[PDB]
Amino acid sequence: PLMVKVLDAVRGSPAINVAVHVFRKAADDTWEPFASGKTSESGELHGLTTEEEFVEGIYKVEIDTKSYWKALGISPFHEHAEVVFTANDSGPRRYTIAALLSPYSYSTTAVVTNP
Amino acid sequence: PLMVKVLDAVRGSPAINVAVHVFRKAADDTWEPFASGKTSESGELHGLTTEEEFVEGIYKVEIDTKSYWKALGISPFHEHAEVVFTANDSGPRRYTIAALLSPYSYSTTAVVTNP
Amino acid sequence: PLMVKVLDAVRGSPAINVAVHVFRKAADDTWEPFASGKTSESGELHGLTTEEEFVEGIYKVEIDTKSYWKALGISPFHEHAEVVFTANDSGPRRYTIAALLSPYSYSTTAVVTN
Amino acid sequence: PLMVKVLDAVRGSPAINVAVHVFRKAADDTWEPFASGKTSESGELHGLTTEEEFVEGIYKVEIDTKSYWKALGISPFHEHAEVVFTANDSGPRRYTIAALLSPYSYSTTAVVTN
Ligand SMILES: Oc1c(Br)cc(-c2ccccc2)cc1Br
Ligand SMILES: Oc1c(Br)cc(-c2ccccc2)cc1Br
Incomplete structure (x- = not known):
């Protein structure tokens, strides 16, 4: 239920081998490690989590x-x-x-679907 | 070799049923109709053209x-x-x-791959 | 009532000396030249038009x-x-x-104010 | 040497009265408060800092x-x-x-000049 996709606006290509770390806010207000990985040759990172593990919470996706x-x-x-x-927070979604x-800029968006 | 994908930054969703018209610049410098279609429920429009038909040229993709x-x-x-x-213009590519x-803004990018 | 601003996402700077052409759609659906210029050191192009000339209609801004x-x-x-x-004319007055x-991408927005 | 500007892609306008907090990374890797304010009618927040205070280091701008x-x-x-x-300090002086x-998206850039 969580996928990260990274594109390169200079090259017109997927951004490959980009490290991504995901954190979840704990009960004591600290960011706890949740998952991590690297984008593939398509610029996509799949398999970070499962629907069981990906409970309600505040998540941070850090793209290196x-x-x-x-x-x-x-x-x-x-x-x-x-x-x-x-x-x-309204039940399971896919994100x-x-x-x-770009070197001095980025744009980010979310696509949220209900399975 | 040509795909168009359209996302909605307000809803966080694919932009579905968006009309797309493609033109190609003719020898007399006019824009000739080349192909057209509508985005699907995934926000993607496939099947606009074939590798035989999609020759070198200057193309305009108009998203309505x-x-x-x-x-x-x-x-x-x-x-x-x-x-x-x-x-x-350096041989066939996939685009x-x-x-x-957004209502007052858009961002566009190209991903160009060599098959 | 019209200003054009261009920025470079590779260098993190204004996009200087970029040619900008503005066209107005004519009654026969062709694009008639309206205004043009080059962006300044600040990436901005001011003074393209006046309130009197900038009547309601469809305009195209082409950035080279x-x-x-x-x-x-x-x-x-x-x-x-x-x-x-x-x-x-019913919206705010300044565009x-x-x-x-970026080499393979651009983002554009409009800021329309009174 | 630091200005923050926020725009609204839904309304085509400056994003007015948006809270902005700036932090400096401390030697122990925590984020220490540095500057804050609310964007003005132009969507801009000026006067956050001075040249003397804005030393080399890692900063975070948080936009609410x-x-x-x-x-x-x-x-x-x-x-x-x-x-x-x-x-x-070896780059241009003004950031x-x-x-x-947008509700589900944002674009950010840096314009760094002398
Ligand atoms: O599959 C996507 C692609 Br192709 C491009 C984008 C995109 C992100 C930021 C600005 C423009 C397009 C997003 C997704 Br999802
Ligand atoms: O002064 C501006 C700056 Br600096 C950035 C933008 C901007 C445009 C497109 C995407 C992100 C920021 C617009 C303005 Br007027």
Whole structure:
């Protein structure tokens, strides 16, 4: 129920091998590690979680954009791109978090569907 | 080799039933109709053309955003969103033209792959 | 009542010396030249028109993105970026058309105020 | 040396009265409060800091997008929009952090000039 997709606006391509870390806000207001992975050759990261594990909560998806750009010889502006949202608070949903990256800019959107 | 994908930034959803018209610049510098269709329930429009038909040229993809918004009770800013590009000028490629729509804004990107 | 602003998402800067052409849709559906200029050091193009001249109608703002990227030695995707809209007298009076440019992408918005 | 600008992609307008908090990363990796304010009628927040105070380091700009949409009676996706970056003295001296807001999306860019 959670997929992350990352595109490169410079190359016109998927952003491949981008590290993504997901956190969930705990009862004591700290960000607890929830899941992590890397985008594939399609720019997509699947398999982060399961419908059982992905309970209601506040989640942070951190996309490690700086590491991505530095490898292309670009010293970029941002440290990362973070997307913070409440999930599943009206019951289970499927979420795609998409990010379109440039060295000094990004755009992010969510596509939320009800299975 | 040509796919168009349209997302709605207000609803967090695919933009469904969006009309798309594709034109190709003719030898006399006019825009000739090339293909057309509507996005599906996934926001995607497939099957516009074939690799044989999609020769080198300058193409315009016109996405009829105004008609889309007016149906949601939004009087939007733009008449349409147009994407104009040279295709296949170094040999055949596959193109995804993506657009993320808001009433007064859109973002568009291309993902170009070599089969 | 019309300003155009262009920004560069690769360099994090205004997009300077970008050609901008504005057209008005004529009664026969062709695009007639209306205004043009080049963005300034701030990425802005002011003074395109006046309140008297900028009557209701459909306008097109064409931004020459391809020449901008080529001058930087970067290969771009689009031929240009086009923004097509209706000017409406019942709305607010001042229009800013902004474009944020990347080689294979652009974002555009309108800021319409009184 | 730091300005924050926020725009509304639904209404085509500045995003007015949006709370903005700026933090500086401390030596122990926590975020210490640095500056805050509310965007003006132009969607801009000026006067957050001074050249003397704005030393090299990692900063976070947090924009309270959820309250903005809620005030408009619109249900949004994000809790807030965060922009995290390093201030660098070898670059140009003035930073504009801009955010273009929609209920389920935002675009952000940096314009860094001398
Ligand atoms: O499958 C997607 C694609 Br192709 C592009 C985008 C996109 C993200 C930001 C701006 C424009 C398009 C999003 C998704 Br989902
Ligand atoms: O002064 C502006 C800045 Br700085 C950024 C934008 C902007 C445009 C498109 C996407 C994100 C920000 C618009 C304006 Br007027």
